[PDB]
Design a protein that fits this description.
It comes from Calloselasma rhodostoma. The chain has 68 residues and is mainly beta. It has no helices and 6 strands.
Length: 68
């Protein structure tokens, strides 16, 4: 139940007072979230350098986690 769906003290999609958003977009901040909306699936959110599967967003996630 995180009431903070964003972390920007100067964002329109999200109010810092309640660190939440206005029921118009999907997120206020995040790597897999652009235009206050989530990024499509397969969204590269991290790229190391060795030989491995680049980190891509599930398309429904707003930020990018860390697995593997």
């Amino acid at each position: 139940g995180k009431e903070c769906d964003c972390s920007s003290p100067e964002n329109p999609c999200c109010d810092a007072a309640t660190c939440k958003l206005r029921p118009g977009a999907q997120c206020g901040e995040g790597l897999c979230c652009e235009q206050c909306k989530f990024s499509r699936a397969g969204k590269i959110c991290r790229i190391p350098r060795l030989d491995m599967p680049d980190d891509r967003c599930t398309g429904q996630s707003a930020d990018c986690p860390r697995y593997h």
